[PDB]
């Protein structure tokens, strides 16, 4: 049938594996998978967007631009979003931070456009800084 569950037996394993940070002592695990689902809720999201490609890369859309208006739920949401859209898209990051590195060059590259980018938007920031 259908797709079921965020993360499936092959996917667990690489999360496990995933660390939250680039040089830290606490790898990924299901605690996070569902400490999100349960805050996605809160913010009019269905946690059922967590175990879809798509909705993943939604979430991302809005937490993005939000990141340095966001407080410390929102800051851990992007973080978790990330390894796990990772996963249901290709990328096999090791850890939170690389998959951030990952997703903003995806949406850099539109950057150099910036005809589809540049509409709906009221004030792009031309300043961007690595973490
Ligand atoms: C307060 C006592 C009660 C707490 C029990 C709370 C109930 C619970 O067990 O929830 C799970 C967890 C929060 O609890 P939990 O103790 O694991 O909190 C995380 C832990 O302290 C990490 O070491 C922090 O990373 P860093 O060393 O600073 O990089 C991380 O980010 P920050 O907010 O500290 O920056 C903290 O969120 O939820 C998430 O937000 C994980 C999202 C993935 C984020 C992955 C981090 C990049």
């Keep these: ?6 993360l499936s ?3 667990l394993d690489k999360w496990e594996k995933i660390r939250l940070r680039p040089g830290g002592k606490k790898q ?5 998978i569902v400490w999100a689902s349960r805050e996605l809720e809160r913010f009019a999201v269905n946690p059922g967007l967590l ?7 939604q979430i991302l859309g809005q937490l993005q631009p939000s990141l340095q ?4 739920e929102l800051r851990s949401l ?4 990330a390894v796990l859209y990772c996963v249901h ?3 096999d990051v ?3 931070k690389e998959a951030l590195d990952k997703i903003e060059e995806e949406q850099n590259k539109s950057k150099k456009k910036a005809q589809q980018a540049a509409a709906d938007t009221g004030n792009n920031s031309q300043v961007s800084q690595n973490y």
């Design 9 to 11: 037996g092959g996917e």
């Design 1 to 6: 049938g259908a797709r079921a569950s965020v």
């Design 94 to 96: 090791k850890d939170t």
């Design 78 to 81: 992007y973080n978790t979003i």
């Design 69 to 72: 208006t966001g407080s410390e």
């Design 28 to 32: 990924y695990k299901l605690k996070h």
């Design 51 to 57: 175990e879809t490609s798509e909705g993943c890369r």
């Design 89 to 91: 898209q290709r990328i």
